[PDB]
Amino acid sequence: LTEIEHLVQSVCKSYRETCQLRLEDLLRQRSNIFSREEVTGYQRKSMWEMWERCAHHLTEAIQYVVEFAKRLSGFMELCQNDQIVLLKAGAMEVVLVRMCRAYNADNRTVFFEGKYGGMELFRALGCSELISSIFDFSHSLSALHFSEDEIALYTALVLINAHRPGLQEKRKVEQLQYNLELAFHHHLCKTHRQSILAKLPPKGKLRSLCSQHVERLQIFQ
Ligand SMILES: CNC(=O)[C@@H]1CCCN1S(=O)(=O)c1ccc(Cl)c(COc2cccc3c(-n4ccnc4)cc(C(F)(F)F)nc23)c1Cl
């Protein structure tokens, strides 16, 4: 009881403290859309330049997720090895989930460098299939109309995953995961939102999208 509802409020607080982007700013900026000439500007950048600027933005978003982990009940009590394994496996997946907040399903645009643009803005990356899959993924997640509280609890579980290969204190991650699931399940049951569980994307889907070009990021500043 009591303890579960306390865990729920602690995870929702850690999340709100560690957002890269205030929801109210993303929503207010939805009318601020890149011009054709601004899009053409992005489409003529070199593949290298466009990967450099996307790598920089991904790194910045990852730092806010590392701060989420630091503030998450139980995380900083796991062994250093397991903290590193969970972040390395989970941090980019949490960025991908956080990005459905910055996605406008009404015109299929995403917040990027101060305005909203469609997937054709990212043409110079030369990975149009991946961009289209990230847009498709965000479209599907946007459709759950997550509360900030639901996003907090869901992203806590994306991170605290006792099946990540290379964990050394597997039983201690399982104990923290189990408490987070009881927290998530209790919140959804109480709000009558338990139908969203069957709509959450498979873990293999988050993996493949978030890791398809990991080796490449190393060569960007
Ligand atoms: C919304 N505001 C922001 O500042 C966002 C939050 C997250 C990143 N920034 S953003 O710059 O504006 C930004 C906003 C929208 C878009 Cl669609 C991109 C582009 O996305 C990606 C492009 C290329 C590769 C991506 C990739 N990846 C890396 C290695 N293998 C896969 C993973 C991811 C993902 F994070 F997992 F989704 N996105 C990727 C960026 Cl960068």
| Cβ–Cβ under 8 Å, residues 200 and 154 | yes
Structure tokens at 176: 């923290």
Identify the helix (H) or strand (E) that includes residue 112: strand 109-112
Structure tokens at 177: 């995961």
Determine the distance separating the centroid of ligand 1 and the alpha carbon of 194, expressed in angstroms. 29
| Cβ–Cβ under 8 Å, residues 111 and 29 | yes
- Check the CA dihedral 12-101-42-207 and report its sign: positive
Compute the half-sphere exposure of residue 28: CA atoms within 13 Å on the CB side of its CA.
Answer: 6
Indicate the burial class of 4 (C-beta count within 10 angstroms; 0-12, 13-18, 19 or more): middle
With tokens 């000439």, the residue in question is: 37
CATH of the domain at 157: 1.10.565.10
110 within ligand 1 shell (Cβ under 6 A): yes
Determine the distance separating the centroid of ligand 1 and the alpha carbon of 96, expressed in angstroms. 7
Indicate the burial class of 165 (C-beta count within 10 angstroms; 0-12, 13-18, 19 or more): exposed
Solved how?
A: X-ray
Q: Which residues pair with 117 in a beta bridge?
A: 110
100 within ligand 1 shell (Cβ under 6 A): no
Residues 136/142/148/150 CA torsion (nearest 10 deg): -80
The atom of ligand 1 lying closest to the CA of 113 is 12
| Cβ–Cβ under 8 Å, residues 28 and 115 | no
Amino acid of residue 88: K
95 within ligand 1 shell (Cβ under 6 A): yes
* Residue of minimum CA distance from atom 23 in ligand 1: 54
Q: Supply the range of the domain harboring residue 37.
A: 1-221
Determine the distance separating the centroid of ligand 1 and the alpha carbon of 56, expressed in angstroms. 10
Q: Give how many domains the chain has, as a whole number.
A: 1
**Overall residue count recorded for the chain in this entry:** 221
Q: How many whole angstroms separate alpha carbon 101 and alpha carbon 199?
A: 17
Contacts for 197 with CB less than 8 Å, ≥ 6 apart: 188
Q: How many whole angstroms separate alpha carbon 134 and alpha carbon 132?
A: 6
Determine the distance separating the centroid of ligand 1 and the alpha carbon of 215, expressed in angstroms. 15
158 within ligand 1 shell (Cβ under 6 A): no
